[PDB]
């Protein structure tokens, strides 16, 4: 069985899609002419509005620095433009026999081939927009590396300045992609772990203050402690943002 | 001998290395989907 689509606004554009082209295969196999209207222009209008989607993604791909992007669009691109030709040919067959068999075949292969890519290309952006968060994420991860050279108030000042927006950009990113996931275990761990990352961040900075002031043993393994448990949180939520069901 | 980064050097490093378009590729999706759901509802009828 095809699997429920990864968001939800992927799931909004292509489940019409799919359910009908479902309905098509139960009426091709379970239906029974003249009735058949020419489909010469509305396959015309899909050639088009692919044409633009190929276009647009070209656009979109080329004002990128994710090389990733760049390997993995080009093959959806090929898959909905051999699609079309599919329906193209099939119109043509239907024209000059409404009973052709190919034709049927061809409507029905060159449909799905047409989801089946623009979901290629869609869960290929979803995945260069993940790689942004998860850049983020291993931003603070590494920021957090450096809390151990912070030895003087005036450092804890310049080192709390940047934490804080940091945190927040990161918050932020994980509530807006958490809510638009399709599989609920997964929305409650990002949601779990981004809160026990955002309470441990008064912890760290209470930690830093009692041994900065010390300084100028206790506060010292406290701190690398929380460094530890919110660096493990972080990478929690690098993984459950790359889980998927579509590979 | 080598010259370390300070603090506030080392921290704006670590923020530029980390921290429209996604509207028009829905858009573009959608007139793809509604053009074969077109196609689709013609020769079924629907």
Not at chain 1, 13 to 26: G, K, R
Not at chain 1, 201 to 221: D, G
Not at chain 2, 29 to 46: F, I, P, T
Request: hydrophobic share 40%; glycine share 4%.
């Amino acid at each position: 069985q095809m699997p429920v689509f990864h968001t939800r606004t992927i799931e909004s554009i292509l489940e019409p899609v799919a359910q009908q082209i479902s309905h098509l295969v139960i009426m091709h196999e379970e239906g029974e002419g003249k009735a058949i209207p020419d489909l010469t222009a509305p396959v015309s209008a899909v050639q088009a509005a692919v044409s633009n989607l190929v276009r647009v993604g070209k656009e979109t791909v080329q004002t990128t620095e994710d090389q990733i992007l760049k390997r993995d669009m080009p093959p959806a691109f090929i898959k909905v433009e051999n699609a079309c030709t599919k329906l193209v040919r099939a119109a043509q067959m239907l024209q000059a026999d409404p009973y052709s068999v190919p034709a049927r075949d061809y409507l029905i292969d060159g449909s799905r081939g047409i989801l089946s890519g623009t979901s290629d290309l869609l869960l290929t952006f979803d995945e260069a927009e993940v790689r942004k968060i998860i850049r983020v994420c291993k931003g603070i991860l590494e920021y957090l590396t450096v809390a151990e050279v912070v030895e003087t108030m005036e450092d804890l000042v310049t080192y709390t300045k940047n934490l804080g927006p940091g945190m927040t950009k990161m918050a932020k990113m994980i509530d807006e992609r958490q809510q638009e996931l399709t599989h609920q275990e997964h929305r409650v761990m990002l949601v779990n772990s981004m809160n026990t990352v955002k309470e441990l961040l008064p912890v760290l900075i209470s930690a830093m203050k009692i041994f900065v002031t010390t300084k100028n043993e206790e506060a010292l393994k406290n701190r690398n402690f929380t460094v530890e448990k919110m660096s493990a949180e972080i990478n929690e939520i690098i993984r459950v943002l790359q889980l998927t069901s579509w590979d | 001998g080598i010259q370390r980064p300070s603090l506030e050097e080392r921290l704006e490093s670590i923020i530029s290395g980390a921290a429209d378009r996604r509207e028009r590729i829905v858009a573009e999706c959608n007139a793809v989907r509604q053009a074969l759901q077109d196609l689709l509802s013609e020769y079924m009828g629907n």
